[PDB]
Design a protein around this ligand. Structure first.
Ligand SMILES: *Cc1cc2c(cc1C)nc1c(=O)[nH]c(=O)nc-1n2C[C@H](O)[C@H](O)[C@H](O)COP(=O)(O)OP(=O)(O)OC[C@H]1O[C@@H](n2cnc3c(N)ncnc32)[C@H](O)[C@@H]1O
Ligand code: SF4
Ligand code: F3S
Ligand code: FES
Ligand SMILES: [K+]
Lengths: 259, 604
């Protein structure tokens, strides 16, 4: 009979958020935390709200804060004990309801890095796949598996303080993924844009992003590599490069973009 | 905008096209429509990257020829055989002839495919694929990206949609379609789960790119979000659904978690063994033991456990042995399976067998569609009659490319091909700039009333209890091996569960992220589709593809080579009956480039 304290907020009453304690028999519940939450909703309090889809850790929708550390509920294990298992929303996020965070800023920041392949020449008619060696494909190994759970984001003390100026670990790793993709031909443009004091150099190497990553990725290592590459490759003309690309995006629609 | 229907704040949007769904099929359709210069919106219940397409692992089939010599026509023959001559050969040709182009386009947008020694895309062996129209050997057509080919595709298609600047309405749950009196879809009526407002999207052409209804069974590989919402919308519009009896059980699903182990595991050397330690799959489908069609493998596994040669303390499952394969290949080609096993099963792939059992995975049925992805409302004289303003794509749609059994790595191909086709078809119908659609006067009235009636529902039964009842009945009354007696019992039970939805009650009465209400609206969709599945299956007195009746163990081409159309009599699930009609299968290929694959034996 484990005790599960869960954060609760009603967006309509707008009463101060509180932790409600539930008792669940682990014998009739699945090993993972998400199973306990589903059981609570099914049996005791159906009002409980939380995001969940894949159940196998791949969608990245069940990101929560369990006993202090961020994680995905579907991959997290229930750890029985006298101490209540405290489940709260993602740290320093606006709570839409109960355990459902507001990750709209995270989605916007990602759209900013323009995560789509860019090439100077359009695929000539009669052309097959763009060549990439096995070794080049190996470079993109630990970076293309990010499920956007947003745990590393909501674990960085620097994203807690400057959420609207710092891109955050996940977005920065994704930017390195596109700066490291041999097929992309806009390496300099991407590095010039990311070379900003607020966007990139707000990372102080806390390493909370790597510790909490549910997919076992290392966003901290990627940001360190991206900072070294930028420092070595900087040229006086980078600012003009950013401006020219901004002119190219003049007719784009209203949303975050390279500028 | 601003209106007030039945006390609810109703916003009005007037686009040229609306796409319900942001999964593989929906992201592709939207990018295509925007690329054609048409004003479009894309509604989704979840952030597009969290759709079930992300959980795909195997890959997409294309006759790229990177591993061995290949022809699309050979891929087309394999699909016809796999469909057990229930799929349309017109649509199969269109899909197979475009598979090379579609896959290369995805690479052109940055899809991180696995690579060969020459810098080309690596292709893996999958079940049901051959060369030289069956006279050759195993065909390596499944362009994979490690064990994460879905994550790759969905992320890349989202990037493409960002590049084209697609208007996305994220976390909006679609409720119904804004049908006209004449019988034409004029858009959709949705709700925002973040603001609580009702939105009436009005479009000239609507694309239903929802997923399947796999969460209607107790054990599934589907996501909790897979409730078949677009099928319910069509059924509540009075339009038909097709081939709902053909539910695919994937041979290998982790026991009892219900997770999916990629068919690529077997396609890279994995062997299924029993209590006797025998690779039993050689007895059934001898030429392709473990790489047989998913329906043959599943039936073989079920019979083996039934015969007593099952593994485990309860002798309830089967073992998949990947331990003999090289550790590097496991780490390189099957990187994701290993971790999932270590967690949900506690197995070390390199040293131990994985417990597996056949589990519901995909649904070959869906909205009837033609080869242009236009939804059909067949009539006795016009079996190909199309709903004027409606299109469908993805698992939600049933163009019958997959027929009675889907070949692995063909669904992700159907997402890209038919999403693209749907965008092309709308482009011809709706011009880039067009006068705005005239939403009918009482647009949403019924939907708002039902939403309010369900919002303020105070009946005895709970949504969760009713869902568990339905999931139990489907799992027990429509298993891998179906019998007519159980199918009849179940058909009575699902009808009772239908009239029990009138007693459902919810405790939360808010409109912002009211999961209780959303889940009850989803249960309505799940009930109607699950009902049509049982009714259609009991009515089919043959054994084709995934539908395996013990009473009738043989295919009946003479009297059962037909598509099965189900209709919900009344818009309310607690006031309706499931009527069944039939429409003929399209057997002639659309061009002469491919020949008609005559109906034949499917031994594998
Ligand atoms: C379940 C599955 C499927 C699968 C697979 C592995 C698993 C575990 N592996 C595959 C493979 O290796 N090779 C292959 O060819 N196919 C494989 N599949 C099949 C495929 O992934 C599924 O069939 C998939 O579901 C098809 O994609 P589709 O785009 O049609 O659907 P989706 O990914 O489930 O997303 C649908 C979207 O619609 C939204 N939605 C749902 N209801 C609504 C409402 N009411 N309003 C608005 N939007 C709605 C969903 O949120 C989702 O975004
Ligand atoms: S880096 Fe890790 S924690 Fe951050 S979004 Fe990607 S998978 Fe999630
Ligand atoms: S915790 Fe934050 S400061 Fe950098 S090392 Fe990780 S993104
Ligand atoms: S439910 Fe998908 S990551 Fe947990
Ligand atoms: K590059």
């Amino acid at each position: 009979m484990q005790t599960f304290r869960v954060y609760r907020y009603d967006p309509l009453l707008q009463d101060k958020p509180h932790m409600q304690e539930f008792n669940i028999d682990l014998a009739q519940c699945g090993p993972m935390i998400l199973d306990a939450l589903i059981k609570i909703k099914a049996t005791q309090d159906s009002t409980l709200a939380f995001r969940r889809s894949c159940r196998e850790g791949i969608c990245g929708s069940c990101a929560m804060n369990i006993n202090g550390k961020n994680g995905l509920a579907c991959l997290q294990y229930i750890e029985p004990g006298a101490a209540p298992i405290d489940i709260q929303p993602l740290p320093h996020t606006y709570v839409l309801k109960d355990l459902v965070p507001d990750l709209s800023n995270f989605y916007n920041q990602y759209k900013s890095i323009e995560p789509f392949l860019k090439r100077r020449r359009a695929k000539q008619p009669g052309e097959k796949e763009y060549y990439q060696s096995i070794e080049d494909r190996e470079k993109l190994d630990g970076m293309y598996e990010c499920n956007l759970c947003a745990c590393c984001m909501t674990s960085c003390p620097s994203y807690w303080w400057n959420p609207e100026y710092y891109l955050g670990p996940a977005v920065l790793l994704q930017a390195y993924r596109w700066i490291a993709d041999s097929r992309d031909e806009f390496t300099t443009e991407r590095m010039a844009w990311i070379n900003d004091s607020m966007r990139l150099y707000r990372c102080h190497g806390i390493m909370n992003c790597t510790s909490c990553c549910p997919k076992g990725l290392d966003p901290a290592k990627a940001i360190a590599k991206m900072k070294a590459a930028i420092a070595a490759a900087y040229e006086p003309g980078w600012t003009k490069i950013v401006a020219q690309e901004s002119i190219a995006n003049k007719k784009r629609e209203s949303g975050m973009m390279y500028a | 905008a601003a209106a007030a229907a039945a006390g609810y704040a109703v916003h009005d949007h007037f686009y040229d096209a609306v796409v319900v769904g942001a999964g593989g099929a929906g992201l592709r359709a939207a990018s295509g429509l925007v690329a054609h210069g048409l004003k479009t919106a894309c509604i989704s219940k979840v952030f597009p990257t969290r759709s079930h397409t992300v959980a795909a692992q195997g890959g997409i089939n294309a006759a790229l020829g990177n591993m061995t010599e290949d022809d699309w026509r050979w891929h087309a023959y394999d699909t016809v055989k796999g469909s057990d001559w229930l799929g349309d050969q017109d649509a199969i040709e269109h899909m197979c002839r475009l598979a090379p182009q579609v896959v290369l386009e995805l690479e052109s947008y940055g899809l991180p495919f696995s690579r060969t020694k020459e810098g080309k895309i690596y292709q893996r062996a999958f079940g049901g694929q051959s060369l030289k129209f069956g006279k050759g050997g195993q065909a390596y057509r499944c362009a994979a990206a490690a064990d994460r080919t879905g994550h790759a595709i969905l992320h890349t298609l989202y990037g493409m949609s960002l590049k084209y600047d697609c208007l996305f309405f994220i976390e909006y749950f679609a409720l119904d379609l804004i049908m006209d009196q004449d019988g034409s879809c004029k858009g959709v009526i949705a709700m925002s789960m973040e603001d609580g407002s009702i939105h009436r999207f009005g479009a000239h052409q609507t694309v239903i790119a929802t997923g399947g209804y796999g969460r209607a069974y107790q054990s599934c590989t589907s996501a909790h979000t897979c409730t078949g919402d677009g099928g319910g919308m069509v059924s509540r519009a009075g339009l038909p659904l097709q081939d709902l009896e053909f539910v695919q059980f994937h041979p290998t699903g982790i026991f009892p978690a219900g997770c999916l182990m990629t068919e690529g595991c077997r396609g890279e050397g994995g062997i299924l063994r029993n209590s006797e330690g025998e690779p039993f799959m050689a007895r059934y489908a001898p030429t392709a033991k473990d790489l047989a069609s998913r329906d043959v493998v599943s039936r073989a596994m079920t019979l083996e456990i039934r015969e007593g040669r099952g593994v485990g303390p309860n002798k309830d499952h089967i073992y998949l042995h990947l331990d003999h394969l090289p550790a590097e290949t496991l780490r390189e080609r099957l990187p994701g399976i290993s971790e999932t096993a270590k967690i949900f099963a506690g197995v070390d792939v390199t040293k131990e067998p994985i417990p597996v059992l056949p589990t519901v995975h995909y649904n070959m049925g869906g909205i009837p569609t033609n080869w242009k992805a236009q939804c059909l409302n067949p009539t006795s004289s016009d079996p190909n009659k199309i709903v004027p303003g409606l299109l469908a794509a993805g698992e939600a749609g049933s163009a019958s490319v997959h027929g009675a059994n889907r070949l692995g790595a063909n669904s992700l191909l159907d997402l890209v091909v038919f999403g693209r086709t749907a965008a092309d078809t709308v482009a011809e119908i709706v011009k880039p700039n067009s006068p705005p659609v005239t939403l009918p006067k009482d647009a949403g009235g019924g939907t708002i009333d039902r939403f309010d009636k369900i919002r303020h529902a105070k009946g005895p039964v709970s949504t969760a209890d009713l869902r568990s009842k339905l999931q139990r009945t489907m799992q027990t009354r429509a298993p891998v091996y179906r019998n007519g007696d159980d199918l009849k019992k179940g058909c009575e039970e699902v009808r009772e569960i239908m009239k029990e939805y009138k007693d459902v009650g919810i405790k939360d009465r808010t409109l912002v992220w009211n999961t209780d209400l959303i889940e009850t609206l989803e249960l309505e969709n799940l009930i109607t589709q699950a009902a049509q599945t049982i009714v259609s299956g009991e009515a089919r007195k043959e054994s084709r593809g995934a539908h395996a009746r013990e009473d009738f163990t043989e295919r009946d081409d003479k009297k059962w080579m037909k598509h099965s159309l189900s209709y919900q009599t009344k818009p309310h699930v607690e006031e309706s009956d499931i009527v069944l009609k039939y429409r003929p299968v399209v057997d002639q290929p659309l061009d002469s480039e491919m020949h008609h694959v005559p109906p034949a034996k499917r031994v594998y």
